[PDB]
Design a protein around this ligand. Structure first.
Ligand code: CLA
Ligand code: CLA
Ligand code: CLA
Ligand SMILES: CC(C)=CCC/C(C)=C/CC/C(C)=C\CC/C(C)=C/CC/C(C)=C/CC/C(C)=C/CC/C(C)=C/CC/C(C)=C/CC/C(C)=C/CC1=CC(=O)C(C)=C(C)C1=O
Ligand SMILES: CCCCCCCCCCCCCCCCCC(=O)OC[C@H](CO[C@@H]1O[C@H](CO)[C@H](O)[C@H](O)[C@H]1O)OC(=O)CCCCCCCCCCCCCCCCC
Ligand SMILES: CCCCCCCCCCCCCCCC(=O)OC[C@H](CO[C@@H]1O[C@H](CS(=O)(=O)O)[C@@H](O)[C@H](O)[C@H]1O)OC(=O)CCCCCCCCCCCCCCC
Ligand SMILES: CCCCCCCCCCCCCCCC(=O)OC[C@H](CO[C@@H]1O[C@H](CS(=O)(=O)O)[C@@H](O)[C@H](O)[C@H]1O)OC(=O)CCCCCCCCCCCCCCC
Ligand SMILES: CCCCCCCCCCCCCCCC(=O)OC[C@H](COP(=O)(O)OC[C@@H](O)CO)OC(=O)CCCCCCCCCCCCCCC
Ligand SMILES: CCCCCCCCCCCCO[C@@H]1O[C@H](CO)[C@@H](O[C@H]2O[C@H](CO)[C@@H](O)[C@H](O)[C@H]2O)[C@H](O)[C@H]1O
Ligand SMILES: CCCCCCCCCCCCO[C@@H]1O[C@H](CO)[C@@H](O[C@H]2O[C@H](CO)[C@@H](O)[C@H](O)[C@H]2O)[C@H](O)[C@H]1O
Ligand SMILES: CCCCCCCCCCCCO[C@@H]1O[C@H](CO)[C@@H](O[C@H]2O[C@H](CO)[C@@H](O)[C@H](O)[C@H]2O)[C@H](O)[C@H]1O
Ligand SMILES: CCCCCCCCCCCCO[C@@H]1O[C@H](CO)[C@@H](O[C@H]2O[C@H](CO)[C@@H](O)[C@H](O)[C@H]2O)[C@H](O)[C@H]1O
Ligand code: OEX
Ligand SMILES: [Ca+2]
Ligand SMILES: [Cl-]
Ligand SMILES: [Cl-]
Lengths: 334, 95, 37, 39, 135, 57, 31, 242, 30, 30, 31
């Protein structure tokens, strides 16, 4: 009945079109700030000296970039890991030249997505649901944290963070392959298993449900109209799906329990993305993928190349050309 | 059009060790030059003629005999600032 | 820049305090289930 | 506050003859002004 | 082919002499190389100073030349500059200074001989030995 | 008038005409009159005669 | 011919926009 | 700053500031007419930046426009060693020898043009008017300095064209690869004029401080553009060894 | 290519004529 | 002017998002 | 930028044609 109590009831209200919640009271300002600065920067930001060698990179549409090539450029290598808000620049133009929009957008984004995870738990609690949708959402959160926060921290610079753009993302991946051999890292391999399997199982489950729908419609209408929102009854025959799938492979390779099946569907890609996030997070500390260069020698001691050696040649090609003006010393130590 | 180092490569600088422009790694080929004698030569450049690489102050007998035994490996071209500025004759970025 | 810094600090402190005082205000009781705790 | 149905909504109609007249108008207007757009 | 007798035949001195490491000696030299020198001489390079590598041309251009076993053994006892001028005992790993290089203090004359021999035989088994840091 | 005032003071023809601000001379150019355009001559007046660079005198 | 490079988009849209307006209105008549 | 440690100045922008003669005196460094004086820790702090706009007209005055530095507190030459040589005619010669004698600086001009330049005092030889017997308020070293190219000959443009490295053509366009005048990079050696007007002398410690005005070309991008004319004003400090 | 624009608008006009004649709303006596 | 095209398609996407959320078909229990 | 002079008409039509198809179909639903 107090005004604070009234505000609390409104914030935690389950009748708002968009749930706010306490986590939302943080999510909304941070994500809105990040979105505004990101759109403005992507459209209009001046070039950014990412590599700190006074060689500004054009990232914005108005400076000659298309949607594919445009990006918000990570902050200058001269900044390193230093905190660089607007009020630490002698002018907004100095802030822009050194890639301040990247720091603002990433920090607000990171806070916003952690709050989004908390908000998912919060609404599940208010709806009397089970609480673990946020656990599944923690996989993409972990991956985003790896590329925007953990990798820069381990490498020592926000200039090494993933650029906020499409071609910027490819640059990040290529450089990452050149310096870490992520393809030959087992955690990336589990991430690929996670995403290939997640798509495989999405296709499998979708196709098996769609194949086993109960006849409810006529041939002139979409079969989707055979389901009514809120209906008691199941819209497909899991028994028929299991008969088909257990004959496609063998009876014991097929689920007869929807709860067990939906758990597997949730767990597989989530676990795979946790592994890949941890892989990126550990190569942040330069614990790289497998090195098998010159592993096979003949009796005289001559190197017999393998596919890993050819991959290494590709990596060396990427490595010698990257940041072509940024290195003064022979070893790329970060 | 050729830029200045490419044009320099068309001259004798592309055939022999150039006392006024060649970096310290090009002196590795003469036995006993890298690093001290090559350093002293690069420090006392430019030179107007190859012969006057023998007139560097403070040179000892061993270095003088070593320079005279290799006079024919040496050429002298005009100092191009595209190979000297920024201490490029000691470290051009080649490892 | 000082004006902007103070503005940002005020806004952030208000939002963080709102978060903390919200999750402190009997938040476990705000659910459709048992609310005795 | 509730979202009530507005009773002032009316259907809009364009008969086929009006479609043909409008299409011919748009066509001939394009025929007319294209030369001036290209200049 | 196998690690033949001609592969392990390397110059012992500058006066023309040749010695042959045994397979045990080649293996031992490789082991010491991998254990003590690869941190800086990986694949015949020199990370801290690639102007002075372990390539055959480089070893042969030192003063006096280091492309024979005895000169290499001497270099690992008393290291010098590329021109034989400056003392490098406090700057390059050597057995003469166990106080500053404790890692080398248990390598005997046979071990140093073996690692010099391996250093001379490795360039014959790899074209990329002694190249550019990235190559 | 400005030229004739300079001439009355004692300046030469080249000196007097040099007092004329290029901005003033620019206003005295029929290409800047708004009654010289066309209904379908679109865009900036620089898309016509071009960007003015300098008064030729 | 050195035509206005905007003439083609302009003519296309000048005709197509009212055309689609008319088509939308005609096709939904009777709902 | 004389009693400040590294931990007290770090992150504060006090590392890019010129030292200042505290003892407010109008001293005089006495000079024998045929000797040489070493200058130990010469520092030049740039405070004002001006770039000569190039009007499209050819008889309009150019004029100098102020700029804002896009780079941060990385604009100062310091720890510079020089010599003061005295001619028989009382001429003082400043001869900068080495040190941190360059800093790349980028300024923004109104209208959005970024002008980087190689701010330097390299090989500066400044001379005063003949007839000086002391270093005082009237000392004003005027002379030329070298301005090397902003980008080195090892620099690579975004299409990997460079001077002694990189492509010599436009490899992305095989059929038109030899069309582009930018395929030829050059690094011509520019010249600047610097004046050191000395305003404060502390004869008890040999210190000199003053104001400077520099004039130098800007970066040309390996010859990709004509350089602008940059004017730099600021303060300097030096110590004279007696 | 302006020729393509001109032919296209003329063709639209002629096709509208064809449809307006061949497929008109049939006048009916009610 | 390609910048105008890019901004326009991005704006169309964002406006579709707004309408799809604010004015969606209301799910009803039948 | 020396873009394809046909890029703008192409992008406009690529989006507008399926857009109008969809709008026509949606607006006439229920007739
Ligand atoms: C949920 C709200 C929220 C949060 C958490 C943040 C968080 C942040 N903002 Mg942001 N910001 C917000 C809303 C928010 N913002 C909004 C709505 C705007 C628009 C006005 C901005 C505009 C903005 C700008 C323009 C900038 C930031 C910056 C920052 C960063 C530094 C903030 C700082 O040092 O404050 C420090 C705050 C404190 C020390 C809090 C003290 C108050 C007490 C201790 C807490 C209260 C608890 C209570 C007493 C119990 C940080 C990532 C900067 C940045 O991105 O840097 C790269 C920056 O330049 N913000
Ligand atoms: C066929 C080949 C193949 C395949 C299948 C993959 C697959 C994968 N790679 Mg690999 N990669 C490959 C080749 C391949 N790669 C090659 C050849 C290279 C070298 C060039 C790499 C280099 C490489 C790197 C360097 C990285 C990967 C990563 C990944 C993963 C990316 C997906 C991910 O993390 O999602 C997780 C989900 C997210 C990242 C999304 C987060 C979403 C946030 C939380 C919210 C976003 C909201 C958004 C802003 C707005 C909402 C939209 C709407 C509301 C409007 C995935 C496992 C990445 C990885 O593992 O990340 C840790 C990674 O960093 N790969
Ligand atoms: C009062 C309104 C007004 C005015 C005076 C101007 C004036 C100007 N604008 Mg702006 N503009 C306006 C509204 C206006 N604008 C609006 C609403 C928009 C959004 C679409 C724009 C978008 C815009 C852009 C994008 C650009 C301009 C530019 C210009 C300049 C050149 C004008 C030109 O070439 O016209 C040409 C005008 C015509 C050829 C007249 C067209 C007449 C139509 C086609 C007749 C059709 C009538 C109808 C079909 C017949 C009736 C049929 C019957 C059955 C009913 C000029 C300063 C240009 C410029 O230089 O900017 C710096 C430029 O690039 N304007
Ligand atoms: C010419 C002659 C003589 C004739 C030849 C034939 C003959 C007579 C031969 C006799 C011998 C013979 C039969 C074969 C000998 C040769 C031989 C052994 C061949 C090798 C076989 C081979 C190469 C195949 C290997 C590939 C394979 C199929 C392996 C298994 C893969 C596997 C177990 C996948 C399942 C994945 C998995 C984890 C299961 C669930 C996936 C999933 C999420 C599904 C979604 C889902 C599941 C449900 O369950 C239901 C319910 C629903 C709703 C649902 O969504
Ligand atoms: C969906 C919503 C809208 C759909 C758009 C479809 C309309 C297309 C029809 C074309 C209209 C005008 C195009 C002319 C040619 C062209 O491309 O112009 C192109 C020009 C732009 O002109 C360009 O300008 C550039 C400078 O930025 C350069 O100078 C270029 O050379 C020049 O071509 O467009 C305009 O100027 C549009 C603004 C129109 C101004 C209105 C003037 C006054 C209004 C009077 C209206 C009279 C009413 C009639 C009475 C009934
Ligand atoms: C963009 C620019 C940036 C600005 C952002 C927009 C402003 C956001 C502020 C909204 C907060 C309060 C709004 C509201 O409706 O609160 C409604 C609640 C009470 O409704 C309570 O609402 C509860 C829930 S509901 O309304 O049924 O959903 C109900 O259960 C309870 O009985 C009732 O008392 O009112 C308050 O207690 C708020 C007091 C003032 C605090 C905010 C000031 C601003
Ligand atoms: C980058 C931008 C491009 C957009 C692209 C993506 C689309 C996003 C748009 C989604 C927003 C639409 C919600 C519709 C609201 C609605 O129907 O009712 C709005 C209702 C109340 O309005 C009404 O208010 C009425 C007021 S009164 O009492 O009648 O006076 C009252 O009837 C009652 O409270 C209620 O009915 O509000 C709520 O449900 C409570 C809060 C909702 C707002 C949450 C934040 C919205 C977004 C911020 C989150 C971060 C975003 C980051 C970047 C996108
Ligand atoms: C948002 C930016 C731009 C918006 C785009 C939308 C633009 C709107 C365009 C509307 C189209 C109007 C035309 C509809 C026309 C139409 O609906 O048909 C005629 C129509 C019939 O009216 P009724 O009262 O019978 O209404 C019946 C309903 O079916 C109409 O909705 O009356 C009018 O609209 C009269 C005014 C226009 C009459 C035009 C007739 C001229 C035809 C001659 C052909 C040219 C030949 C010339 C040879 C020289
Ligand atoms: C939702 C609003 C968020 C806006 C984010 C920030 C807005 C702009 C802040 C910059 C305003 C201050 O601008 C700066 O002021 C200082 C004074 O200390 C000047 O010095 C700088 O030359 C000037 O660039
Ligand atoms: C409502 C919830 C809580 C909100 C309360 C927070 C209010 C904000 C108080 C702190 C914000 C201002 O805090 C003050 O910022 C200025 C930045 O100009 C800092 O100033 C610092 O940097 C400036 C220039 O960068 C230097 O001149 C100064 O020597 C240095 O101390 C002060 O060290 C700090 O005390
Ligand atoms: C609230 C929603 C609106 C968002 C906020 C709007 C503010 C953003 C300002 C940008 C709008 C366009 O305004 C102006 O655009 C031109 C066009 O590139 C930019 O110009 C910039 O790029 C061009 C070409 O790349 C250069 O020639 C120019 O020197 C440079 O400054 C200006 O820097 C900007 O001030
Ligand atoms: C956040 C601000 C929103 C966008 C601001 C401007 C909206 C639309 C403007 C785009 C027009 C750009 O106009 C383009 O400018 C670039 C330089 O930038 C020129 O080059 C092109 O010849 C010109 O066509
Ligand atoms: O910033 Mn981005 O990429 Ca990480 O490794 Mn070192 O740094 Mn640079 O080189 Mn390779
Ligand atoms: Ca070791
Ligand atoms: Cl790169
Ligand atoms: Cl480096």
């Amino acid at each position: 009945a107090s005004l604070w109590e009234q505000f609390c009831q409104w914030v935690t209200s389950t009748n708002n079109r968009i749930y706010v919640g306490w986590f939302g009271t943080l999510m909304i300002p941070t994500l809105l700030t990040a979105t505004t600065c990101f759109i403005i920067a992507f459209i209009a930001a001046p070039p950014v000296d990412i590599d700190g060698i006074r060689e500004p990179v054009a990232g914005s549409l108005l400076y000659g970039n298309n949607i594919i090539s445009g990006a918000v450029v990570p902050s200058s290598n001269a900044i390193g890991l230093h905190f660089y808000p607007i009020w630490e620049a002698a002018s907004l133009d100095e802030w822009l030249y050194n890639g301040g929009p990247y720091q603002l957008v990433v920090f607000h984004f990171l806070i916003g997505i952690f709050c989004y995870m908390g908000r998912q738990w919060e609404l599940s609690y208010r709806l009397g649901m089970r609480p673990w949708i946020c656990v599944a959402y923690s996989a993409p959160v972990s991956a985003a944290t790896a590329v925007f926060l953990i990798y820069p921290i381990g490498q020592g610079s926000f200039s090494d963070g993933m650029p906020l753009g499409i071609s910027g993302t490819f640059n990040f991946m290529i450089n990452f392959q050149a310096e870490h051999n992520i393809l030959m890292h087992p955690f990336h391999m589990l991430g690929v298993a996670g995403v290939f399997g997640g798509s495989l199982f999405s296709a499998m489950h979708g196709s098996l449900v769609t194949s086993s729908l109960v006849r409810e419609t006529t041939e002139v209408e979409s079969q989707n109209y055979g389901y009514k929102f809120g209906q008691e009854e199941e819209t497909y025959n899991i028994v028929a799906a299991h008969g088909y799938f257990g004959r496609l492979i063998f009876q014991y390779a097929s689920f007869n329990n929807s709860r067990s099946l939906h758990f597997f569907l949730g767990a597989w890609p989530v676990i795979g993305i946790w592994f890949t996030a941890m892989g990126v997070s550990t190569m942040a500390f330069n614990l790289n993928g497998f090195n098998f260069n010159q592993s096979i020698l003949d009796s005289q001691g001559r190197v017999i190349g393998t596919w890993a050696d050819v991959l290494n040649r590709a990596n060396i090609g990427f490595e010698v050309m990257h940041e072509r003006n940024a290195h003064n010393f022979p070893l790329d130590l970060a | 059009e050729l830029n200045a180092v490419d044009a320099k490569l068309t001259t004798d600088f592309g055939q022999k060790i150039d006392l006024n422009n060649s970096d310290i790694r090009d002196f590795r080929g003469l036995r006993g030059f890298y690093p001290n004698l090559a350093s002293e030569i690069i420090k006392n450049a430019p030179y107007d003629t190859v012969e006057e690489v023998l007139d560097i102050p403070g040179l000892s007998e061993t270095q003088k005999s070593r320079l005279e035994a290799n006079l024919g490996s040496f050429t002298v071209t005009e100092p191009s600032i595209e190979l000297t500025s920024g201490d490029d004759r000691i470290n051009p970025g080649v490892y | 820049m000082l004006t902007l810094k103070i503005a940002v600090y005020i806004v952030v402190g208000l939002f963080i305090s709102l978060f903390i005082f919200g999750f402190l205000s009997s938040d476990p009781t705000r659910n459709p289930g048992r609310k005795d705790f | 506050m509730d979202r009530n149905s507005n009773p002032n909504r009316q259907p809009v109609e364009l008969n086929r003859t009006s479609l043909y007249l409008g299409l011919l108008l748009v066509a001939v207007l394009g025929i007319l002004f294209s030369s001036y757009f290209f200049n | 082919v196998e690690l033949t007798e001609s592969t392990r035949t390397i110059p012992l001195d500058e006066a023309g002499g040749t010695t042959t490491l045994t397979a045990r000696q080649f293996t031992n030299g490789q082991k010491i190389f991998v254990d003590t020198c690869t941190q800086c001489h990986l694949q015949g390079k020199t990370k801290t100073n690639n102007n002075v590598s372990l390539g055959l041309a480089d070893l042969a251009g030192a003063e006096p030349r280091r492309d024979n076993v005895l000169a290499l053994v001497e270099f690992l006892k008393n290291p010098k500059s590329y021109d034989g001028e400056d003392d490098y005992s406090e700057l390059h790993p050597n057995i003469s200074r166990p106080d500053i290089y404790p890692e080398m203090r248990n390598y005997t004359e046979d071990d140093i001989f073996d690692v010099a021999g391996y250093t001379l035989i490795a360039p014959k088994l790899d074209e990329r030995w002694g190249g550019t840091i990235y190559f | 008038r400005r030229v004739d005032s300079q001439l009355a003071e004692g300046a030469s023809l080249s000196e007097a005409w040099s007092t004329i601000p290029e901005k003033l001379a620019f206003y005295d150019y029929v290409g800047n009159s708004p009654a010289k355009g066309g209904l379908f001559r679109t865009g900036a007046m620089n898309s016509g005669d071009g960007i003015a660079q300098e008064w030729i005198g | 011919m050195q035509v206005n490079n905007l003439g083609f988009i302009a003519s296309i849209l000048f005709v197509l926009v009212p055309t689609v307006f008319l088509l939308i209105l005609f096709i939904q008549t009777g709902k | 700053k004389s009693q400040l440690t590294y931990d007290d100045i770090v992150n504060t922008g006090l590392a890019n500031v010129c030292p200042e003669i505290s003892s407010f005196t109008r001293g005089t460094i006495e000079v024998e007419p045929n000797t040489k004086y070493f200058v130990s820790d010469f520092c030049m702090e740039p405070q004002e930046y001006f770039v000569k706009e190039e009007p499209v007209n050819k008889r309009q005055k150019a004029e100098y426009v102020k700029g804002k530095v896009l780079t941060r507190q990385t604009t100062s030459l310091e720890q510079i060693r020089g010599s003061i040589a005295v001619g028989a005619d009382g001429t003082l010669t400043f001869k900068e020898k080495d040190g941190i004698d360059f800093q790349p600086i980028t300024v923004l001009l109104p209208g959005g043009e970024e002008v980087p330049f190689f701010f330097t005092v390299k090989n500066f030889t400044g001379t005063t008017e003949p007839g000086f017997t002391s270093i005082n308020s009237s000392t004003d070293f005027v002379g030329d300095f070298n301005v090397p190219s902003y980008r080195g000959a090892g620099f690579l443009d975004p299409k990997a064209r460079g001077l002694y490295t990189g492509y010599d053509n436009a490899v992305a366009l095989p059929s038109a690869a030899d069309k582009f005048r930018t395929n030829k990079k050059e690094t011509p050696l520019g010249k600047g004029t610097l004046s050191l007007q000395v305003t404060q002398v502390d004869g008890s410690t040999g210190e000199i401080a003053g104001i400077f005005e520099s004039e130098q070309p800007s970066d040309t991008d390996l010859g990709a553009k004509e350089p602008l004319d940059v004017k730099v004003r600021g303060i300097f400090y030096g110590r004279v060894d007696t | 290519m302006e020729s393509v624009a001109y032919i296209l608008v003329l063709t639209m006009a002629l096709a509208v004529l064809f449809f307006a004649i061949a497929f008109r709303e049939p006048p009916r006596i009610e």
